[PDB]
Design a protein around this ligand. Structure first.
Ligand SMILES: CC(C)CCC[C@@H](C)[C@H]1CC[C@H]2[C@@H]3CC=C4C[C@@H](O)CC[C@]4(C)[C@H]3CC[C@]12C
Ligand SMILES: CC(C)CCC[C@@H](C)[C@H]1CC[C@H]2[C@@H]3CC=C4C[C@@H](O)CC[C@]4(C)[C@H]3CC[C@]12C
Ligand SMILES: CC(C)CCC[C@@H](C)[C@H]1CC[C@H]2[C@@H]3CC=C4C[C@@H](O)CC[C@]4(C)[C@H]3CC[C@]12C
Ligand SMILES: OC[C@H]1O[C@H](O[C@H]2[C@H](O)[C@@H](O)[C@H](O)O[C@@H]2CO)[C@H](O)[C@@H](O)[C@@H]1O
Ligand SMILES: CC(C)NC[C@H](O)COc1cccc2[nH]c3ccccc3c12
Ligand SMILES: *C(=O)CCCCCCCCCCCCCCC
Length: 442
């Protein structure tokens, strides 16, 4: 009973520690490593700063309030502490909203995956975000627009040991809509179209990129022959210069064995043309290919890339079942191949593609798409932590006191605790994980 408040104190103290530690680690990693200095990571800094202020200025005094069962920091700090609280929550959802919009234009840009913003313009945005949040949060609280007019609230306002957030319904509705719901709805809508667009960008180039790997330097394939890009054979000759000679010939310049990713895509597309042509000539492969849809045509091409035409024509039973759109039966047979035994992961995705006729097997495989997922998790996690609390806001406007006071406080703390989640989610990123490892004397 009094023992538990020490124990509750310990837990809340660990929460405060976790928020401050992780977010300082995030802020440090971005500031210290030049690799992590992207426009996206500038917003992550704004997001991490808001969470940090929560862990320092907001959460500790909220904890003391609950443990001590009263406000011991006076009326001025109460209004100020309340203003900071609201600001940080407003700033976070606005920043998240900016990231989603930024990511949208980056992915729909001809110059792909980089922002339409210079590093300075991005900073201006961040500053503007904090200012708008400040205007939205600090102004109404210090102007006393939020206050309710009934007596009980007036007692609490006047009382120096009472810090309760009593509000008039006009504020409760308008504030929670402008601060939270509006940037929420935008963020959810916009980023959902970010996902669609990323899913759109999956094609045979990405498929072979994932299944085979893209090499910018001249390398030797398993057979010892010189190759480059996505399994593009340059020459069977043992001389390197000839492979370079062949490469320069195909590319159209002096490469010295190194090409760009886009040049590799030219070569790959160049190869695909030959791969399709050979398939249409092959008597055993043409009927299957004619019958197949575009997606499954890519899966077959993927196999011809790996095995050659002769190898693929070996699956006589699987080919006939594919031709008859008996996908599952074709999958059972393809699983029993030498091909599945040697490279099971690649075979699994190709076979799965044959089953569904979709790209749902080459999904969040690209490093860039995994990054989009991490940002998705950040947004989702925030939504789920704060939405219940913010629903109750509106619920009590309709009909007040519908929900117990301890429940409302608890939901707020689920919202508070969110500030500690983001640094942990960033460990999904390989770059952040490596940045963290260096920073922790590991
Ligand atoms: C309102 C009081 C209590 C807290 C002040 C809010 C602070 C944390 C806000 C105010 C202006 C913000 C910044 C505005 C400009 C940028 C530049 C960018 O490269 C990193 C983030 C950064 C630096 C912002 C995050 C942190 C920031 C400094
Ligand atoms: C206002 C009280 C309650 C909290 C203290 C605010 C501190 C933690 C905030 C306010 C201004 C912030 C900074 C503003 C400028 C940037 C530059 C950026 O490249 C790294 C983070 C950094 C250095 C911020 C980190 C922390 C920071 C110093
Ligand atoms: C009031 C309470 C929350 C203050 C607690 C401050 C703690 C969280 C601060 C104070 C000193 C900080 C550390 C100082 C030493 C380093 C090494 C650096 O390369 C990365 C950050 C790191 C690991 C800091 C992490 C957190 C840290 C331990
Ligand atoms: O057989 C047609 C394609 O073969 C090469 O690419 C293969 C390579 O032979 C093989 O060692 C490896 O396992 O797979 C790659 C592709 O996944 C050619 O040089 C391509 O241009 C041909 O289309
Ligand atoms: C202990 C209390 C003070 N903490 C409130 C939440 O942490 C933050 O709640 C909000 C954040 C941003 C805008 C907001 N408008 C509101 C209207 C009513 C209640 C909370 C909020 C609110
Ligand atoms: C490598 O980066 C890991 C070793 C870093 C050790 C730094 C020691 C920090 C001591 C923290 C004590 C501060 C407590 C502050 C409480 C208010």
């Amino acid at each position: 009973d009094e023992v538990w408040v020490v124990g509750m104190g310990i837990v809340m103290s660990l929460i405060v520690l976790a928020i401050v530690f992780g977010n300082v680690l995030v802020i440090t990693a971005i500031a210290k490593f030049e690799r992590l200095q992207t426009v996206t990571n500038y917003f992550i800094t704004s997001l991490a700063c808001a969470d940090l202020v929560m862990g320092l200025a907001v959460v500790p005094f909220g904890a003391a309030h609950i443990l001590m069962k009263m406000w011991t920091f006076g009326n001025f700090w109460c209004e100020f502490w309340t203003s900071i609280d609201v600001l940080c929550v407003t700033a976070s959802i606005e920043t998240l909203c900016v990231i989603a919009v930024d990511r949208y234009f980056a992915i729909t840009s001809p110059f792909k995956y980089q922002s339409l913003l210079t590093k300075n313009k991005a900073r201006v945005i961040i500053l503007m975000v904090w200012i708008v949040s400040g205007l939205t949060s600090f102004l109404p609280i210090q102007m006393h627009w939020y206050r309710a007019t009934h007596q009980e609230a007036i007692n609490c306002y006047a009382e120096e040991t009472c810090c309760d957030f009593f509000t008039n319904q006009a504020y409760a509705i308008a504030s929670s809509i402008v601060s939270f719901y509006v940037p929420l709805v935008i963020m959810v809508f916009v980023y959902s179209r970010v996902f669609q667009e990323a899913k759109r960008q999956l094609n045979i180039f990405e498929m072979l990129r994932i299944d085979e790997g893209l090499r910018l330097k001249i390398y030797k394939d398993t057979e010892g022959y010189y190759t480059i890009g996505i399994g593009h054979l340059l020459t069977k000759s043992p001389s390197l210069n000839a492979a370079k000679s062949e490469l320069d010939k195909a590319i159209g310049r002096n490469t010295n064995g190194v090409i760009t990713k886009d040049e590799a895509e030219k070569l790959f597309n160049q190869d695909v043309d030959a791969a399709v042509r050979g398939i249409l000539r092959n008597a055993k492969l043409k009927p299957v290919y004619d019958s197949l849809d575009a997606v499954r045509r890519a899966a077959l091409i993927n196999m011809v890339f790996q095995m050659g035409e002769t190898g693929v024509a070996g699956f006589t039973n699987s080919l006939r079942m594919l031709q008859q759109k008996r996908w599952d039966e074709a999958a059972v047979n393809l699983a029993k191949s030498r091909w599945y035994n040697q490279t099971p992961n690649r075979a699994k995705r190709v076979i799965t593609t044959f089953r569904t006729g979709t790209w749902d097997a080459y999904k969040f495989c690209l490093k860039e798409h995994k990054a989009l997922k991490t940002l998705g998790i950040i947004m989702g996690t925030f939504t789920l932590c704060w939405l219940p609390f913010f629903i109750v806001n509106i619920v009590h406007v309709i009909q007040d006191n519908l929900i117990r006071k301890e429940v409302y406080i608890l939901l707020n703390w689920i919202g508070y605790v969110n500030s500690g989640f983001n640094p942990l989610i960033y460990c999904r990123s390989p770059d952040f994980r490596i940045a963290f490892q260096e920073l922790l004397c590991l």
